[PDB]
């Protein structure tokens, strides 16, 4: 199986947290992913969001397509995805000033708004502790990553996957997410596969042109099946972790396969500020940076 840890309530940076930080990096560098055990109030929010996600998907398509905005990438698309970005009314200057991807979220209904908003503030805390723990394992100052994520561009991909309807069973091709770290959630259906770090396997750097990671290693072994187990969130690093860590963490490649049954899932992104420039940690004299504002607009 894959390891299962329980984060503290607050990461103060003590001997126990730093040990957990080492336990995290190790699990990432061996298995490419691990699980964090949710409590009762974390599993309640996770299921209530999946609940609001399940009712929305069975609504008529003619309604779902209305949940779109020409100001944000938020809203519905046809798997059928509902992305939730930072919710900024047209009263917010960033939306007025015409900042790209800034604007309100076309929620289907307010009970979908509340259930998804409360889920996503909890994932933001688990991500902040994970970002504090990662720095402690690399012997970095505990606030190294969390300094970038103040009012960070956290967003989500509320996912539903159809059952296998043709003789093709592809739901999503091999890819690596483009953020700092991803926090996935999932029901009992199952269908998520990830690729661990393979020794000596060249990994393209997806934040650079001409070095895309998409579709790569898709048909080549191995691909760890991420089992549906009760009350856990799986955590794996994104492209911006790999860039900052200088490859000492690999952006976990993942792909989805369609099951016999309907599959609902989640995909939270704990990201830097939209005005934040990620930097390589172990090469200070290197002038390469990723500005998440243009990065997010580009990958979408
Ligand atoms: Ni992904």
From Swiss-Prot:
Control of this protein's activity is summarized as: Activated by catalase. Inhibited by chelating reagents such as EDTA and Tiron (4,5-dihydroxy-1,3-benzene disulphonic acid), and by DTNB (5,5'-dithio-bis-2-nitrobenzoate) and hydrogen peroxide.
Task: Provide the reaction this enzyme catalyses.
Answer: 2-oxoglutarate + O2 + 2 H(+) = ethene + 3 CO2 + H2O; L-arginine + 2-oxoglutarate + O2 = guanidine + L-glutamate 5-semialdehyde + succinate + CO2
Domain Fe2OG dioxygenase, first and last residues per copy: 152-272
Biological process, per Gene Ontology: ethylene biosynthetic process
Question: Per the UniProt record, which EC number(s) apply here?
Answer: 1.13.12.19, 1.14.20.7
Tell me any Pfam family this protein matches: DIOX_N
What does the record give as its pathway? Alkene biosynthesis; ethylene biosynthesis via 2-oxoglutarate
The pH dependence is: Optimum pH is 7.0-7.5.
State the temperature dependence of activity: Optimum temperature is 20-25 degrees Celsius.
Broad enzyme group: oxidoreductase
Could you say which residues bind Fe cation here? 175, 254
Q: Which cofactor does it need?
A: Fe(2+)
Superkingdom assignment: Bacteria
Residues folding into a coiled coil are none
Record's keyword terms, sorted: Dioxygenase, Ethylene biosynthesis, Iron, Metal-binding, Oxidoreductase, Plasmid
The molecular function GO annotations come to:
2-oxoglutarate oxygenase/decarboxylase (ethylene-forming) activity; dioxygenase activity; metal ion binding
The UniProt record's further free-text remark is: A dual-circuit mechanism has been proposed in PubMed:1445291 for the complete reaction, in which the binding of L-arginine and 2-oxoglutarate in a Schiff-base structure generates a common intermediate for the two reactions.
- Function of this protein? Simultaneously catalyzes two reactions, namely formation of ethylene and of succinate from 2-oxoglutarate, with a molar ratio of 2:1.
Q: Known PANTHER family for this protein?
A: 2-OXOGLUTARATE (2OG) AND FE(II)-DEPENDENT OXYGENASE SUPERFAMILY PROTEIN-RELATED
Task: Please report which protein family the annotation says this sequence is part of.
Answer: Belongs to the iron/ascorbate-dependent oxidoreductase family.
Summarize subunit and interaction data from the UniProt record for this chain. Monomer.
Q: Give the protein's recorded name.
A: 2-oxoglutarate-dependent ethylene/succinate-forming enzyme
